[PDB]
Enzyme design. Structure first.
Site, PDB file in Angstrom:
ATOM      1  N   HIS A 158       0.869  -1.090   0.575  1.00 16.55           N
ATOM      2  CA  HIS A 158      -0.083   0.304  -0.014  1.00 16.55           C
ATOM      3  C   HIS A 158       1.005   1.115   0.184  1.00 16.55           C
ATOM      4  CE1 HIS A 158      -3.151   2.395   1.051  1.00 16.55           C
ATOM      5  NE2 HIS A 158      -4.007   1.751   0.740  1.00 16.55           N
ATOM      6  N   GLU A 263       0.005   1.038  -6.076  1.00 18.23           N
ATOM      7  CA  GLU A 263      -0.623   0.088  -5.114  1.00 18.23           C
ATOM      8  C   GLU A 263      -0.050  -1.098  -6.060  1.00 18.23           C
ATOM      9  OE1 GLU A 263      -3.480   2.598  -2.379  1.00 18.23           O
ATOM     10  OE2 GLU A 263      -3.489   0.166  -2.312  1.00 18.23           O
TER      11      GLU A 263
HETATM   12  O1  LIG Z   1      -8.127   3.365   5.712  1.00 17.77           O
HETATM   13  P1  LIG Z   1      -7.257   2.415   5.379  1.00 17.77           P
HETATM   14  O2  LIG Z   1      -8.254   0.961   5.486  1.00 17.77           O
HETATM   15  O3  LIG Z   1      -5.951   2.287   5.325  1.00 17.77           O
HETATM   16  O4  LIG Z   1      -7.888   1.917   4.199  1.00 17.77           O
HETATM   17  C1  LIG Z   1      -7.633   3.021   3.044  1.00 17.77           C
HETATM   18  C2  LIG Z   1      -8.266   2.671   1.488  1.00 17.77           C
HETATM   19  O5  LIG Z   1      -8.474   2.341   1.043  1.00 17.77           O
HETATM   20  C3  LIG Z   1      -9.512   1.710   0.074  1.00 17.77           C
HETATM   21  O6  LIG Z   1      -8.859   0.485  -0.581  1.00 17.77           O
HETATM   22  C4  LIG Z   1     -10.774   2.457   0.223  1.00 17.77           C
HETATM   23  O7  LIG Z   1     -11.079   2.469  -1.393  1.00 17.77           O
HETATM   24  C5  LIG Z   1     -10.853   3.625   0.707  1.00 17.77           C
HETATM   25  O8  LIG Z   1     -12.282   3.488   1.202  1.00 17.77           O
HETATM   26  C6  LIG Z   1      -9.767   3.641   1.759  1.00 17.77           C
HETATM   27  O9  LIG Z   1     -10.118   4.497   2.699  1.00 17.77           O
END
Ligand SMILES: O=P(O)(O)OC[C@H]1O[C@@H](O)[C@H](O)[C@@H](O)[C@@H]1O
Length: 288
Positions: A158, A263
């Site tokens: 990520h 990502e």
């Molecule tokens: O807030 P997290 O769980 O780290 O994920 C970040 C983003 O991840 C993405 O995959 C989602 O579609 C978003 O809605 C989300 O805010």
């Protein structure tokens, strides 16, 4: 050099000690990568680094499910983006001095207990992090350590790239690729010659090979290059104003202007590993 503390491992490049990477044991989360003193990754000033929740920034690790699942008995029980980023990994040691290279491991016995009880599948993860003079390579190997059960999973890095200003930024080499837009809830081909940003964006590109480098551009300068092996998908995400505002661990609130998540992952479908089989991949960050 390589230095270990209670909470983290820090690599510094022998040829230039101002090139460095900081890895939190919690989630095996890279949270800083400096290239000759310059930060390459975006980290919220309000990110938790204390193990209370996933890190808002750096390179959170997504396994065994990307997003929220509603079709699988067990995967549907896990929170969004799985349990790797919620578990404290073991520091396995250094494997090379130059380029400094270290490994982290995860298995159910040491993972987040609550989440492991929800998804009691067997696995072994080994993350290898290699700090080059001008690149950062994060490699993953997944082994199905079950003797009897298939292992079904997604993997994604990520990655939060740091940039100067989102509204001046463009992302190249995704033109003509199919994506699924998680906001509009539809699939379509990206007919733009570059990707630009003027609102919330949450898209999943498909079919990117080891041969296609993705570039982040600002002011005619190529500020980041992303290469990968064995990760055919690419999520492109920026929360924009409203979502940034609603995330308590996201600061400053204008901070969406200094990040873009690009990502690499395997998320379009699940990887299935037979008993004893292994799968591996990597992301490679650099500058061309
Ligand atoms: O807030 P997290 O769980 O780290 O994920 C970040 C983003 O991840 C993405 O995959 C989602 O579609 C978003 O809605 C989300 O805010």
């Amino acid at each position: 050099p390589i230095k270990e503390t209670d909470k983290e491992v820090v690599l510094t490049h022998p040829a230039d000690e101002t090139t460095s990477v900081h890895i939190l044991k919690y989630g095996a989360t890279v949270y800083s990568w400096k290239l000759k003193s310059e930060e390459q990754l975006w980290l919220s000033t309000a990110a938790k680094l204390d193990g209370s929740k996933p890190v808002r920034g750096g390179i959170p690790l997504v396994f065994p499910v990307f997003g929220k699942n509603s079709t699988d008995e067990h995967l549907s029980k896990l929170p969004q983006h799985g349990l790797a980023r919620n578990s404290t990994w073991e520091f396995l040691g250094q494997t090379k001095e130059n380029p400094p290279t270290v490994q982290f491991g995860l298995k159910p016995e040491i993972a987040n207990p609550e989440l492991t009880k929800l998804w009691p599948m067997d696995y072994l993860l080994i993350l290898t992090v290699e700090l080059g003079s001008d690149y950062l390579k994060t490699a993953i190997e997944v082994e199905n350590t079950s003797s009897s059960k298939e292992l079904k999973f997604n993997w994604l890095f990520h990655t939060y790239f740091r940039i100067e200003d989102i509204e001046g930024t463009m992302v190249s080499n995704l033109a003509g690729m199919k994506l699924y837009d998680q906001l509009l809830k539809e699939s379509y081909v990206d007919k733009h010659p570059v990707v630009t940003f003027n609102q919330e964006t949450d898209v999943i590109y498909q079919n990117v090979s080891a041969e296609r480098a993705i570039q982040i551009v600002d002011k005619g300068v190529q500020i980041h290059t992303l290469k990968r092996y064995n990760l055919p998908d690419t999520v492109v995400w920026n929360p924009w104003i409203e979502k940034s505002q609603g995330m308590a661990d996201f600061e400053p609130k204008t901070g969406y202007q200094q990040m873009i998540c690009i990502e690499p992952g395997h998320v379009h479908d699940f990887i299935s590993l037979a008993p004893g089989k292994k799968w591996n991949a990597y992301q490679l960050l650099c500058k061309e």
